[PDB]
Structure formats: C-alpha cells, structure tokens
From a paper:
The entry, exit and interactions of Q10 within this channel are central yet not fully resolved questions in our understanding of the molecular mechanisms of CI. State α resembles the active form of bovine and porcine CI (PDB: 7QSK28, 7V2C29), with a Q10 molecule fully occupying the Q-binding site. In this state, the 1-carbonyl group of Q10 is situated approximately 20 Å above the membrane surface (M-distance) and 41.1 Å from the channel entrance (E-distance). In addition, active-apo and all different Q/QH2-binding states were dominantly in the closed conformation (except state β), implying that the closed form may be sufficient for the catalytic cycle. Taken together, our findings support a model in which Q10 progresses through the Q channel by peristaltic motion.
A key group of these are the respiratory chain supercomplexes (SCs); these which primarily consist of complexes I, III2 and IV (CI, CIII2 and CIV) in varying stoichiometries, which serve as the minimal functional units for NADH:O2 oxidoreduction. Here we report in situ structures of porcine respiratory SCs, determined directly through imaging porcine mitochondria by single-particle analysis combined with cryo-electron tomography (cryo-ET). Our structures, with an average resolution of approximately 2.5 Å and local resolution up to 1.8 Å in the best regions, enable in-depth study of mitochondrial respiratory SCs in their native states.
Author numbering:
A (entry chain 1a): 1 to 70
B (entry chain 1e): 1 to 99
C (entry chain 1B): 25 to 179
D (entry chain 1D): 372 to 430
E (entry chain 1Z): 49 to 144
F (entry chain 1K): 1 to 98
G (entry chain 1A): 1 to 115
H (entry chain 1D): 253 to 311
C-alpha cells in the first residue's frame, strides 16, 4: 500500500536527475556539442592550448582538419 | 657525515636526495639540473675551501637559476620604466603585445 | 491591492503553521498514554503533519497531559518559556484542565491555565485518542483563523 | 511486581488509612546500586528495565 | 574479471602513450619556435623601451655561461596582456 | 629572492614570537608550535615545487609526520600537568624553581 | 576560476538563508526564553567547566593513526614503479607496524576507556 | 532491597504471588514462571516476553 | 594438532575478526613471492612508456638498435598483447 | 584581482597566524589555525601542487579536532576568552595585524624590501617555469617514490611512529 | 552558464533534500504499520514545503549564554560544505573534474565535523557539549577506517579521480571485488553522516536533541539541510564507488538514470536500517571499530596492496 | 624556598575534581517527563 | 496478471467518484479515493458509505457536507458534524443505519 510512497521518490528522482543531465548538456552546449576535454595532465592542457591557438577564433572546441592545411 | 658509515658499508641511505642532479624518478630533470651538475663537477675533490674561490661563477649561475633576480630585477625595472613612460604617452605597446 | 496580498501571505503562513504543528514530548500521567495511542498506528499523528519532538526550542504546541503538581509547575512554566514564539498549549485531561480527581489536594495545581496560557482544553479522564486528535484539529483551525498580517496592515 | 495495599478501617463507611505498597518505589530506591560504573546510556537502559512508572511511585 | 580488464587498460594506455610519443616532436618544434619568437618580440620591445635609460644594454645575459637557460615564464610573458599571463601561468592548475 | 617567501617567512617569525611568549595556557603555545610547523611545510613545499626537485616532495610529508608526533607528545604532557594540577596554566607550574 | 566561484556560491547562499531566517520571523525575546535548557529546571551552572574524556589516550593515538595514512595514500601512484619488490616490502612494513602499534595498545589497556 | 516481581524472577529467586500465595482462582490456571539467569537487563527483558506468552496461555 | 588446533578453534570461536584479519595478512604477505605473475607486473610497469625513447647517434656498430620503429630488431611486447 | 591570488591568500595565512598566535582561548586559536591551514592549502594548490595541500588539509583538521577535544576537556576555564575580551589578547592581535599591514604596505609599493632578505615583490606569476610534465604530475611521482627510493625514510618514520605510540602510552600511564 | 550549472547543482539538491524528509517519514511510518504524512495535498507532497516555510518564519531565539559568532558560523559552515562536496561527483560528467576528488571529499567531510564542534561548544549547554564530544570520538574513529577503506578500494582504480571509477567498473561492479570492505564502508557512511544506529551525537532518547538542542527555526533547519545533503551525497559516493553503472558517451542520461536509481536504493537502505535497530552505546561504536573494523580493514589493505602485483593487474594512472 | 622533599615527590595536592551534575529529569523523553534524576557523573561514567 | 487488474481498478477509483473532477475532489477533501456503497445521507448533506471488505475500523466512513448551518465546510471539517442518529452507526456501535 506503499505506492503512496512512490511519488516521494519519483519527484526526488527528478530532482537527482536535474543536475546530471544539465551539466552534461551544458558541457555539450558550451563546447560545441562534443564532450568537455579534460586536462588531467600537462600534455592534455598543451593540446587544448594549441587547439585554441590554431582555431584562430580563440575557442578550443572549434576544430580544423584537412581543410585548414594546404 | 661525522661517522660516515654509508661509505664504509657502501650503502645508500640519504645520498639519493642530497642533490637535484641525482637519478630522479622517471628521469624527470630538475629545474636547474645543468647548473647544479656544472657546479658539482667543477668543485669535486678540489676541496670545500678552494670551491668558493675557484668554482665561483658556476655557483653564482646556479644560485641565480634557483632564485633568479639578476634576471627578475631586470624584469621589474623593465616593467617599472614601461609603466612609467607609457603613462604620459612616450610609448605605446605593439599590437602583438596585447592581442 | 495590499489587503489581498497580505491576506494571501496570512493564508500561506497560517497554513504552514497549522500543517507542521510540532508537539512536545511532555507526557506527565495516564493522559500521556492516550497521547501515545494517537501516535500509535491507529490514529498516527504523523499523517496530520504533527511529529513529536523534544527540546522545546524546536516545538510549537505543548500538550500538558497529566496532573500538574506544585513540585513540577516551575519546571513546566520554565519549559514553556523556552519555546520560541508562536507557541500553543493544549491541555489534556481533567487534571491538567482544572484539577481532575485531585482538585482538592495539597500539592496539585488547580488547572494548568494558572501557570501557562492554555489554548485548547481537551476534556477526558483520560480523553480518548480520537478526542485528543479532535482537540489538535481544533487548534489547527484556530491557527487557520489567525489574522497577523491583516492586523499589521491595519496597525 | 508485588503491588499491595495496607488498608486500615475504623468501622465507618470510609477508610481510615490506605497505604499503597508500590514495587516501583522499591525498584527506584535501588537504581543507584544498579548503576555503578555504568555510563549514562546504561542508566537509560536501567530506568527502563524497571518499567518505572511515577504515578504508582508518587502515590 | 578485474585482472583481465586492468590488463586490457594497460594495453590501451601503452597505445595512447606511444601515440603521444609519435606526436611529441612536432609539439617540441612548435614550442621552441614559439618561445624563440616571444623572446625576439620582447627583445625588440626592450630595445625601444630601454633607450633613454642611463645604461641598459639590451639582450644582455645574466648567467655568465653561454649555454641556454629555459626562460622563466615571467621573462616570456612580462609585456603580454593580463589574459595571456593568467592563462599561461594559472592555466592548467585552474582548468577543472 | 621572491615575494611569497616573504609572507611565509614573516608568518613563521610571528609564530616563533608567539611560541616564545606565554600568557595563560599550555594548549595555545602548542597551537603556536603547530603553526610554526605549518609555515615550515608551506615554505618547503613552495621551494621544492618551484625547483622541480621531484625526489624531494616527500620531505614535507615527513615534516608533517614528525609534526603530529611532537604535537601528540606535547598534549600528553599537558594531560599529565592537568592530572597533577587540575588545570593547564603555566604560571602555577613553579614547583621546580627551588 | 571554477572552484572558488563554487565555494563563494555556497557560502553566500548559506549566509543569505541565515539572514532571512534571522531577520524575517519577527522575534520577541525575553530573558527566560533564552535561558539555558536543562531538562526543565534551572541548570546547576557550568557548561564550560572541564569535561573529562576517558578516551584521551584513544583520541590522541587517533592523531598518529590518521597521520600514518598520509604515508599510506601515495600507494595508487607507488604501485606503478619499476621496483615492485621494494614497494611491496615497504607498504607491508607500514601496515605491519600499524598492526603492531594497534596490538600494543590493545594489549596494554590502550583502546579500553578509562573509568 | 525490597525488590519484587520480575527483579526477583529475573535473578534466580523463584517467587511469584500467582503461585506461592494464589488469589482469586489463580490456583486453577496452569502457567510457568520465567525464572531469570544472570539478573541483567537482557535476562529481565526475556523474562517479560516469556511472561507475555504465559499470560497468553492463562487467557 | 592438539594444543595448536585447539587454540585455532577457540580463536575462531571467540574472536573470528582477529582470525580473519591475521589469515588475510599472512596470505597477503607470503603469496606475492610465490606467485609467478609478480615479475610480469614489473615488466608491464617497464613496458609503459612515459618519456620519449630518445634516439641515439648511429655511429655504425650497434646492430640491435632499430633504425625505424617498424624494424624487427629491438625489444618487443607481444607477450603483453597476448597476456 | 586574479593577478595576485597567491598574495591575498598569503595575507589571509598571516592573519590566521596572528589569530592563534595572540594566545586566545584554545578553541579560537584552533579556528585561526584552521583558516590559516585552509588558505595555505590554497596557496600550495595555486603553486602547482595538489596532493600536498589536501594532505595539509586532512592532517591538520585531524590534529586540530583532537586539540579541540582536549581543550574543552582539560584546557578550559569557566570564562573562555575572546580576541576582544582581554586587553592582552587584544594587544597581541592589534600588534600582529598592524604589523603585517605595514609590512605588506612597505612590500607592494616599493617591491624591493631588504628586510632580513632582499624581497623583490613584482609578482608570483613571474617565478613560474615553462615546463612540460607529460602524462605524469611531478608531485605525484615525487611522493610516490617514497616506497621505491626512500626506503630508509620509510624505516625511520615507521619506527618513530611506533615508538611514538609507545611513549604516548608510557607518559599517560600515571603510575 | 557555469553559473547555470552551479545553480542546477544546488536548487535540485535542496529540493531532493526536502523530499528526503517526506520519503523518510513515509518509508519509516510504513515500516511501523503507520501511513506517514498524508494530509497536505496528495500523498504529503507538500510537507517539505510546509515545514520549510515554518522553520524560516518561526522565531530563531539566541541563548543568553551563547557565543553569537560561532553559533552563527556553524550552520553556514555545515550547509556550505554539504553543498560543496556535491561538485566533484562524476554524475555522467563531473562539474569539477578534479585530479584528487577522493582526497578533496575526504577533506571536506573531515571539515564538516567542525560545524558540529563549534555549534555544540558555542551553545553553552551540558547536553550540547556532551554531544560535541561524542561527535569528536565517533568521527575520529570512523575517519581512520574511512581513509583506509578508500585507499584499499581505489587501489584498483589507479588514481583518485572519480570519473575513472566508471572506467574501472566497465564490465563488473566493484562490489564483486571488494564486498568485505564495502560492508565496512557502508557502516562508515552510516556513522560519518551521524545517522542510525550511530546517531549518538543527537541521541534523542538520552541527549534530548544533542547539538541541535539550542538550535531553533532557521539554523536548525539549516543543520538538517547539511545532514540530509550529506546522507544523499554519501549514498551517491557509495553508488559511484562500488555499484558502477553503464555509461554511453552519446547518451549520458542513461548513466544519470542508473546512478540516481542506485543512490535512491542506497538511501532507502539507510532509512531501512534506521527503522530496524536499537541504538549503539558510545564506547561500543568505538570498540566496534578499534577492535573489529580496524584490524580487518588493515588486513584487507595489505591484501589489496598485494593483489594487483600477484596477478599482474596494476591499473593505469592515466 | 623550603628544600625539595627527601623522596623528591611533592605531596599529592588537594582534590581538583569538577564532575558534571545535570538534570536528567523533566521533559526528557527517557525520564518519562516526571522524574528529576540528578546524577553526579564524570563525563559519561556515572 | 494481478498487476494488470491492480492497474485497472485504479481507473474504477476515478470512475466511481464522478470522473476525474470528483476524483480530485475526494482526494483533496477526504484524502482517500476508495469507493463504497452509499449507505445513506443526512439532512445536512454528509454522505455515509460502507464497505464491509475493509478491515474493522475503515469499513464505514463519511464524506462531510460542503455547507452546514451557515458555515463553509468544503475545506475544514470535524468530527462534530455527525448527526446524533448516525453517530451510532459510524462509530461501529450498531449495525443498524
Ligand atoms: C518498485 C516500483 C515499480 C513500479 C510500480 C509497481 C507497482 O506498484 O505496481 C502496482 C502493483 C500494486 O501496488 P502495490 O505496491 O502492490 O500496493 C498495493 C496495495 O495492496 C494496495 O492496493 P489497493 O488495496 O489500494 O487496491 C488497488 C490499488 C493498486 O495500486 C495502484 O494501482 C498503484 C499503482 C500505480 C497506479 O489501486 C489504488 O490504490 C490506486 C491508487 C494509486 C495512487 C498513485 C500511485 C503512483 C505509483 C507510482 C507512479 C509512478 C511514479 O504492484 C505490485 O503488485 C508489485 C509489482 C512489483 C513490480 C516491480 C518492478 C520492478
Ligand atoms: C579572527 C578575527 C576575530 C575578530 C574578533 O574580535 O572576533 C570576535 C568574534 C565574536 O566574539 P564573541 O565571543 O561571539 O563575542 C561577541 C560579543 O562580544 C558578545 O555578544 P553580543 O550579543 O554583544 O554580540 C553582538 C556584538 C558583537 O558582534 C557580533 O556578535 C557580530 C558578529 C561578530 C562581529 C565581529 O555587537 C557589537 O559589539 C556591536 C557591533 C556593531 O569572535 C569570533 O570568533 C569571530 C571570528 C571571525 C573570524 C572570521 C570568520 C570568517
Ligand atoms: C513509562 O511512562 C512514560 C510516561 O509516563 C507518564 C511518559 O510520560 C513518557 C513521555 C511521553 C512521550 C515521550 C510521548 C510519546 C511520544 C512518542 C511515542 C513519539 C512519537 C513520534 C512520532 C510519531 C514521530 C517520529 C518521527 C519520525 C518517524 C521521523 C522524523 C523525521 C523528520 C525529518 C521530521 C521532519 C523535520 C524536519 C526538520 C524536516 C523539514 C524541513 C525541510 C523539508 C526543509 C526544506 C527546505 C527547503 C526546501 C529550502 C529550499 C530552498 C531553496 C530552493 C533556495 C534557498 C535559497 C535562498 C537564497 C533563499 C514516557 C516516554 C514514558 O515512558
Ligand atoms: C517566505 C515567507 C513569506 C511570508 C513571510 C511572513 C512573515 C510574517 C512574520 C510575522 C508577522 C510580522 C509582521 O509582518 O508584522 C508583525 C505585526 C505587528 O503588528 P502589531 O502592532 O500587532 O504588533 C504585534 C504585537 N507585538 C508588538 C507585541 C509583537 O504583528 C503580527 O503580525 C502579529 C499580531
Ligand atoms: C522562499 C519562497 C519560495 C516560494 C515558492 C512558491 C510557492 C510556495 C508556496 C507553495 C504552496 C502555497 C499554498 C497553496 C497550496 C497549499 O498549501 O494548499 C493547502 C490546502 C489545505 O486545505 P485544507 O486546510 O482544507 O487541508 C486540510 C484539511 N482537509 C484534509 C480536511 C482537507 O490545500 C489545497 O489548497 C489543495 C491543493 C491540492 C494540490 C496541491 C499540490 C499538488 C501537486 C504538488 C507537486 C509537488 C510540488 C513541489
Ligand atoms: S485527567 Fe484523569 S486521566 Fe488525565 S491525568 Fe488526571 S486523573 Fe489521569
């Protein structure tokens, strides 16, 4: 007769749902759809900085491949 | 050491950490490895009293590399003079120096 | 209009106060046993928003359940003083109401009202847990009829 | 426990002296002997193992 | 199960590290060119800025030796803008 | 000889001054001692992180290691002065003067 | 950039909630209301006199025990070295010495609380 | 100490007024007195539960 | 057996947590020497490259050093791929 | 501004030092050391070190909790003192705060103070080194070498800790 | 929109904490054959809002013997740290991808005791000081095993970053590898959150209300905020550590749903054990650990130290 | 400055005990609300 | 199988109470959605239901009238709104309505 208990979790589940999606979506929105690149070590940060430099528009997520080179 | 038991037994207990040029983990170099190596190789066996007079500029370069203000004083006065003279319009920074 | 806004604020605040009445664990005598039986599964204070809580600092309503004697009256008055406002006193049982069986004794306060301002008088010896629940609901309606911000608006 | 009454009449229609022997009185009299070295939580356990009721104790 | 998965992860890490190794020389070349270019820019700026100074012979070395020293990050970005120094120094430490 | 070093050295100086001056209690002096230890840790960590002396990063850990040991021994001493004295103040600790 | 912005958000949200909690409810305070709570009757009078704690030995050795975990925690990075024999011997040395310390305390009353 | 009831039954003392000095018609019903063993709180609690069961038998 | 078995059984009866902790500790102490995979672990830690394999000047003689990463001569870690 | 960061955190470090060096009630001194240790961990974090700062955090919070637990037990009084209650603690706090105020005043304008040591205070960003740590944090490999290189340190530290427990036992024996 | 993320990690967490009270008073009540809150709207879905409104409009008295400053700074400390320790959790993608998330959360959990400490001491009460000292002993005892168990479990992770746990439990839950430690860990999560059967800091039966005894209205509601946010965060950390879940890089919502369900189940077990046990007696919960948890966890620490080496299964650090 | 004792031990000082004495009494849920248990206790051991 | 029937009778719950509007009416007023045979009604408007299948205590119940004696009782109700004749039947003091 505990189904009356179930709404309490339900809305609460929604509560615990809200951050986990939002951050992910934010990480996709602010970084051009792709996952936020994580720099756990200096090499990754150097790669990110070189990406920011090459992009020309000063955003690391903007990526250039074969079209950029001759 | 007072009673250097380490050389007598040929056992390493603290000599690995004494200097920055020793074998660091994963061969990570020190910030001033070259200067320390040059200074140490300079005054080895020569004597700890002859080291000050003979191996002087090596130790001076090493201590600079450690602390760096015959270079940072240079920078401080450079920045001071720049901010001074820019105030009343003698100099303007080039575009690559602000974006 | 300002009257409508303060009215709605009154309804909200009064609803909160009446829907989260936190009582105190101040059972004194046999009237406490019914005070437990309405906390028992059958009547279950909890569904009405009322949950027992000691440490008067975090309680609103005091159900004086049991005989209030001379040796205890200073403690009851002091403990009522600890309660931060708003505070309400529900008097359970004839003993806590006007004296009950031992109304003519030498060491019984002839009514809890002589020590604290009692808000709801619940009669019985002991009152049936249904009757005490009815008294609590009557106190709930009392809080519902409060007009604090209205009086402030007509200061 | 052993709940008792010492009822003393006088031949009239009302009692002359009704003393109430209460197990709770004697049990609470021995609370201190029980709680020796025991902590406060043990005292909480002990005043419960007597099923102490002060309606009967205070008469 | 953990043994097998950890061994596979070790193989994957070895592959990633060898990819980084294959790519490192280009990064080294680009980095040395960038630091040399920045030092050149700072020297040209210092030439103009240190002109009416009593005696500030520019391009002077501090260490008596001639072997190159890994330039301190202050003397690589001293005249650069605020965002440049903030991102260069407190860049990896602040990227969370 | 850079700036942050000045602040940590100055903090150690005030902690040394605070240790060398007692007012009432024994806990306060011990706290000032562990503050001296804190300043030492921060200074040494700054030095070795700056110099990339990778093999020497264990040195602040060993510092803290013996730090906690001395703090423990000092507060046990305070336990005994409280057991034989009721309190911890130092001005009443005078039985050895003669 | 991110971490102190976070910390600031939490502390200002908390300080705000405190402010609304402490300025809105229209408090009415008198002396007996703020009187200390001592299960009804007036307190004997203390609340700052020395309060004996019999686990003082246990409390202080917690400091050494928690201190050792500083030595212990570099293990996830220590396992990935080329000298696993020495690393294993030293890690087991730390753990064995902690076991010996705990056993010495256990046998020599130690962990048992004072009376 | 004047203890009675469970605190006697809980400490080995074989005493119960329902059996030793029967009153009303307690000399007819059949029940067992849960004599305790150690005299602690746990023994008295077990005694109380067993008294509940024996009273169920008497009911 | 006898005294030793009785002591083990009584310890299992009275304080099983201590028995379990001591057994786990002794196992974790003495097994790693016996197990043959330990050496493998070391080799894996040696296999993982963190720094660049800085090339050495080919002044001729040395045959073992490869002249190209794809060249067969030189250390190989097929064992790790299989294992 | 975010230019200095380390400077401001060092000032909070010194202020926390003044707080507990003024001999207040030991609980208040513990709080002052707590804020000082937190901001010191912040400084160590901002100086390219993560493990060391969090280690200071954890270890010092453990130690200061035990200091509190002893303070309200042994080293307490019927009238605990505040940084403003007594004139002596107020004087110590005033001396420390005005002192550090005038030290940082003489520091951040001239930026060439000689006091004890020559202190050219341009900026802490300057002294940073342009380097590459690859795929390993230098501090992590540094304190991870304790079990591989510093075996002697392992032995001496373990022996010291065990005998520290022994002495904590013997001192507190009380006959 | 980093501000957007920060607000999205606070308001939903506070709402979840609010509804935690309702689900507790319902699950507990249904354990005890009762019905729990049922009157306010449908199924009591308004009780958290109702008592939230009361606690912030009820008079927040300040005791005459209090120490004002710490009496106020303690609730702020508690709530701020309870909210802050949610930021490094690897809910699909952690908000703050720290390299030392485990150590950071240990540090803030150890700091959270100082809120209890200062609130208890500043209140100037016998019961409050008693509860503060019980908190001292409880949290030190359980913190030792917290640190050791975290080290032992993360030895298979390869580092202290929370995100890699998802990579670690790619094919199997970590509980199948360290189920003994997990048990101990769970108990520690029960005690560090100061919950049953170790909720002796409050001790409603013997300490009236413990360190909340002089805390009324807003500050009391705030300490309750800290306690329940810590409950949910601890259950989330336990779910992240042992009961890993599948994570599709393209649809993080799947991992969000699985993680949230696991946290909900762990919290429900928290309320379950809260309504099925008597309460420990101070020294026992110490003698439980210093004599039964500590030796076992030391032995398991040595076992998990040796285990990757004997099987050539040392996890990578990157 | 009287000379130190021959046994080099200062005589044991007077009693300095300040054991707590709280009202485990009315309004307490365990004390049934109508008890006043005045307990002279040292810390937790009564 | 019983899952489907259980989901189904939850729709008889809304069907019995005059559709969805009456369903929320009884849910928000009497806090229950259970249906029962209309045993009777009094002159004041209270409706009196019984369901012998329910366990002893909830086999009989009231939905109180919206209005009694010049007082809105749509939201606030009490146990004194029971007429004396029916107070016997409601409190299980008799089986004769
Ligand atoms: C775990 C949860 C899994 C999902 C829900 C499963 C569920 O409860 O199904 C209903 C059904 C009956 O509900 P119950 O929890 O058994 O309690 C029934 C009582 O006997 C009481 O039954 P009753 O005597 O009241 O008679 C029948 C009753 C039957 O109860 C229901 O109809 C409630 C079910 C939802 C409609 O109908 C009503 O009471 C209708 C009231 C509905 C109120 C709102 C319920 C919201 C539930 C959550 C929604 C999503 C969030 O569940 C089961 O029989 C068990 C199924 C377990 C499946 C596990 C799958 C994983
Ligand atoms: C470290 C810096 C410590 C600075 C200091 O003196 O703190 C005293 C402060 C208050 O001492 P208390 O023992 O509560 O006595 C306050 C009144 O004297 C005794 O209570 P009261 O009722 O008089 O409190 C109101 C009183 C004192 O003001 C307050 O209580 C407001 C909060 C503290 C403001 C300072 O207001 C005034 O005196 C007038 C203010 C205009 O004690 C602290 O521990 C505050 C440290 C804060 C450090 C930074 C935390 C972030
Ligand atoms: C032998 O003789 C005896 C006697 O003989 C005479 C006696 O007398 C007595 C004494 C008698 C008694 C003790 C009486 C009997 C008592 C009982 C039987 C006890 C019965 C108890 C119960 C039925 C209840 C038990 C409680 C339970 C099961 C659970 C309690 C738990 C809870 C969580 C309760 C709820 C409390 C709280 C604080 C939660 C609410 C708070 C919130 C939801 C806050 C939410 C806030 C927000 C959402 C804020 C949001 C903010 C946001 C979004 C932003 C903010 C930011 C801004 C900037 C503003 C005894 C014992 C006796 O033995
Ligand atoms: C989120 C919450 C939103 C709603 C917050 C409502 C807060 C109400 C606080 C209590 C009312 C105080 C107020 O506004 O005026 C007090 C007014 C002041 O008017 P007053 O002159 O009757 O003063 C009340 C009597 N004394 C002064 C003794 C306290 O009083 C009342 O509202 C109660 C009567
Ligand atoms: C800081 C400030 C934050 C401000 C946020 C904005 C909203 C705050 C207040 C929210 C509630 C306002 C009051 C209106 C509702 C209310 O309490 O009604 C009580 C009143 C109480 O009426 P009553 O007093 O007759 O109820 C008790 C008596 N019986 C049981 C006999 C009926 O009820 C209603 O108005 C009925 C509402 C039914 C639906 C309720 C909502 C259901 C959906 C909830 C979903 C989850 C939400 C989270
Ligand atoms: S009114 Fe009756 S039941 Fe209540 S305390 Fe008095 S005698 Fe007992």
């Amino acid at each position: 007769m505990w189904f009356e208990i179930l709404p309490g979790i339900a809305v609460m589940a929604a509560c615990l749902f809200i951050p986990g999606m939002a951050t992910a979506h934010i990480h996709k929105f602010t970084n051009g759809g792709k996952e936020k690149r994580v720099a756990h070590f200096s090499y990754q940060w150097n790669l990110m900085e070189r990406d920011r430099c090459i992009s020309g528009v000063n955003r690391y997520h903007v990526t250039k491949g074969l079209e950029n080179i001759d | 050491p007072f009673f250097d038991v380490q050389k007598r037994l040929g056992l390493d207990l603290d000599r690995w950490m004494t200097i920055q040029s020793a074998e660091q983990p994963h061969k990570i170099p020190g910030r001033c490895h070259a200067f320390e190596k040059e200074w140490i190789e300079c005054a080895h066996g020569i004597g700890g009293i002859r080291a000050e007079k003979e191996c002087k500029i090596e130790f001076d370069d090493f201590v600079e590399c450690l602390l760096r203000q015959k270079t940072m004083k240079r920078l401080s006065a450079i920045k001071r003079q720049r901010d001074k003279l820019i105030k009343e319009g003698k100099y303007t920074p080039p575009p690559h120096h602000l974006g | 209009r300002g009257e409508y806004v303060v009215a709605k604020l009154d309804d909200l605040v009064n609803w909160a106060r009446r829907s989260s009445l936190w009582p105190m664990t101040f059972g004194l005598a046999c009237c406490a046993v019914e005070m437990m039986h309405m906390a028992a599964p059958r009547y279950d204070m909890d569904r009405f928003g009322v949950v027992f809580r000691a440490s008067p600092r975090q309680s609103d309503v005091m159900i004086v359940a049991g005989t209030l004697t001379n040796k205890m009256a200073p403690a009851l008055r002091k403990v009522y003083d600890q309660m931060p406002e708003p505070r309400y006193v529900v008097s359970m049982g004839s003993c806590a109401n006007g004296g009950g069986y031992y109304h003519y004794s030498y060491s019984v306060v002839r009514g809890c009202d002589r020590i604290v301002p009692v808000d709801i008088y619940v009669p019985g010896c002991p009152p049936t847990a249904e009757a005490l629940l009815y008294g609590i609901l009557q106190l709930q309606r009392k809080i519902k009829r409060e007009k604090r911000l209205r009086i402030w608006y007509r200061r | 426990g052993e709940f008792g009454v010492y009822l003393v009449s006088d031949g009239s229609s009302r009692p002359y002296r009704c003393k109430i022997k209460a197990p709770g009185f004697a049990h609470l009299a021995g609370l201190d002997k029980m709680s020796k070295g025991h902590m406060l939580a043990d005292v909480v356990a002990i005043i419960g193992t007597q099923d102490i009721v002060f309606g009967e104790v205070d008469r | 199960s953990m043994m097998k998965w950890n061994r596979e992860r070790r193989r994957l890490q070895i592959e990633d590290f060898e990819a980084r190794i294959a790519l490192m020389p280009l990064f080294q070349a680009e980095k040395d060119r960038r630091v040399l270019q920045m030092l050149r820019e700072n020297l040209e700026e210092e030439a103009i800025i240190m002109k009416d100074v009593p005696d500030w012979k520019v391009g002077e070395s501090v260490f008596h030796t001639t072997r190159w020293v890994t330039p301190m990050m202050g003397e690589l970005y001293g005249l650069r803008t605020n965002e440049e120094i903030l991102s260069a120094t407190y860049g990896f430490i602040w990227y969370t | 000889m850079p700036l942050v070093y000045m602040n940590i050295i100055m903090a150690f100086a005030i902690a040394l001054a605070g240790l060398l001056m007692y007012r009432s209690h024994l806990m306060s002096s011990l706290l000032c001692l562990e503050g001296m230890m804190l300043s030492l840790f921060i200074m040494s960590t700054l030095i070795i992180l700056n110099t990339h002396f990778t093999l020497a990063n264990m040195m602040p850990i060993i510092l803290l290691v013996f730090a906690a040991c001395e703090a423990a021994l000092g507060l046990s001493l305070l336990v005994m002065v409280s057991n034989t004295y009721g309190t911890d103040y130092v001005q009443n600790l005078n039985l050895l003067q003669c | 950039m991110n971490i102190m912005l976070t910390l600031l958000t939490n502390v200002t949200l908390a300080s705000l909630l405190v402010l609304i909690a402490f300025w809105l409810p229209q408090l009415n305070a008198y002396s007996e209301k703020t009187s200390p709570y001592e299960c009804g009757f007036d307190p004997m009078g203390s609340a700052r006199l020395p309060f004996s704690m019999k686990f003082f030995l246990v409390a202080i050795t917690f400091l050494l025990f928690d201190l050792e975990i500083a030595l212990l925690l570099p293990l996830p990075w220590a396992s990935q070295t080329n000298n696993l024999k020495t690393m294993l011997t030293m890690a087991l040395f730390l753990l064995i010495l902690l076991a010996a310390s705990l056993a010495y305390e256990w046998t020599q009353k130690g962990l048992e609380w004072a009376e | 100490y004047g203890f009675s009831g469970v605190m006697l039954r809980g400490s080995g003392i074989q005493w119960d007024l329902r059996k030793t000095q029967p009153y009303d018609v307690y000399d007819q019903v059949e029940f067992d007195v849960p004599i305790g063993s150690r005299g602690d709180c746990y023994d008295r609690y077990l005694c109380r539960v067993e008294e509940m069961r024996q009273s169920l038998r008497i009911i | 057996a006898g005294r030793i078995a009785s002591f083990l059984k009584n310890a299992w009866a009275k304080e099983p947590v201590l028995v379990a902790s001591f057994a786990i500790g002794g196992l974790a102490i003495i097994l790693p020497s016996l197990s043959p995979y330990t050496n493998y672990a070391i080799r894996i830690n040696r296999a993982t490259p963190y720094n660049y394999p800085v090339p050495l000047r080919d002044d001729g003689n040395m045959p073992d050093v490869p002249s190209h990463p794809q060249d067969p001569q030189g250390p190989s870690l097929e064992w790790l791929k299989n294992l | 501004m975010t230019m200095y960061i380390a400077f401001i955190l060092s000032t909070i470090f010194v202020i926390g030092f003044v707080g507990f060096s003024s001999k207040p009630s030991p609980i208040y001194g513990g709080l002052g050391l707590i804020v000082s240790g937190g901001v010191g961990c912040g400084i160590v974090l901002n100086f390219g070190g993560s493990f060391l700062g969090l280690m200071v955090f954890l270890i010092y919070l453990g130690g200061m909790l035990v200091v509190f637990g002893y303070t309200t037990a042994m080293a307490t009084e019927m009238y605990p003192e505040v940084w403003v209650s007594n004139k002596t603690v107020f004087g110590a706090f005033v001396s420390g705060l005005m002192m550090e105020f005038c030290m940082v005043y003489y520091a951040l304008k001239e930026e060439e103070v000689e006091i004890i040591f020559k202190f050219n205070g341009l900026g802490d960003w300057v002294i940073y080194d342009t380097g590459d740590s690859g795929f390993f944090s230098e501090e992590a490999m540094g304190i991870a070498a304790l079990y591989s290189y510093g075996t002697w340190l392992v032995i001496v530290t373990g022996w010291s800790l065990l005998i520290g427990v022994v002495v904590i036992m013997e001192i507190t024996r009380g006959n | 929109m980093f501000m957007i993320n920060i607000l999205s990690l606070i308001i939903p967490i506070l709402l979840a904490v609010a509804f935690l009270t309702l689900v507790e008073r319902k699950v507990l009540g249904y354990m005890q054959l009762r019905k729990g809150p049922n009157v306010v709207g449908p199924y009591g879905l308004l009780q958290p809002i109702a008592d939230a409104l009361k606690l912030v409009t009820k008079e927040p008295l300040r005791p005459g013997t209090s120490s004002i400053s710490m009496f106020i700074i303690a609730p702020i400390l508690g709530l701020s740290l309870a909210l802050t320790m949610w930021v490094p959790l690897p809910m699909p993608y952690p908000l703050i991808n720290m390299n030392l998330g485990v150590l950071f959360m240990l540090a803030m959990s150890s700091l959270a005791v100082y809120s209890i400490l200062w609130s208890g001491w500043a209140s100037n009460s016998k019961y409050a000081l008693i509860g503060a000292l019980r908190a001292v002993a409880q949290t030190i005892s359980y913190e030792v095993t917290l640190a050791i168990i975290l080290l032992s479990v993360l030895l298979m992770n390869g580092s202290y970053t929370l995100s890699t746990l998802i990579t670690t439990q790619e094919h199997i839950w970590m509980i199948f590898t360290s189920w003994p430690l997990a048990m101990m860990w769970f108990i520690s999560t029960l005690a560090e959150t100061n919950r049953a059967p170790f909720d002796l800091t409050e001790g409603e039966s013997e300490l009236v209300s413990g360190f909340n005894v002089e805390y009324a209205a807003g500050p009391f509601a705030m300490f309750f905020m800290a306690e329940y946010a810590n409950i949910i965060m601890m259950n989330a950390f336990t779910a992240i550590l042992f009961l890993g879940a599948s994570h599709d890089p393209h649809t993080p919502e799947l991992y969000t749903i699985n993680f949230v369900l696991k946290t909900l189940a762990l919290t429900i077990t928290f309320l379950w054990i809260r309504a099925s046990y008597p309460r420990f007696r101070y020294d026992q919960l110490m003698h439980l650990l210093w004599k039964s948890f500590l030796p076992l966890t030391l032995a398991l620490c040595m076992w998990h130290i040796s285990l990757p080496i004997m099987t050539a299964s040392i996890p990578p650090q990157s | 400055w009287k000379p130190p004792p021959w046994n080099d031990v200062d005589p044991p000082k007077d009693t300095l005990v300040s054991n707590l004495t709280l009202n485990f009494g009315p309004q307490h849920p365990a004390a049934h609300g109508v008890l006043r248990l005045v307990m002279e206790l040292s810390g937790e051991m009564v | 199988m019983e899952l489907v029937q259980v989901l189904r009778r939850g729709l008889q719950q809304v069907s019995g109470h005059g559709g969805l509007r009456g369903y929320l009416r009884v849910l928000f007023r009497a806090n229950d959605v259970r249906v029962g045979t209309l045993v009777g009604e009094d002159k004041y408007g209270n409706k009196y239901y019984e369901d012998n299948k329910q366990f002893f205590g909830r086999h009989r119940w009231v939905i109180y009238t919206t209005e009694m004696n010049g007082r809105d009782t749509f939201w606030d109700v009490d146990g004194s709104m029971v007429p004396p004749e029916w107070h016997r039947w409601l409190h299980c003091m008799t089986d004769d309505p």
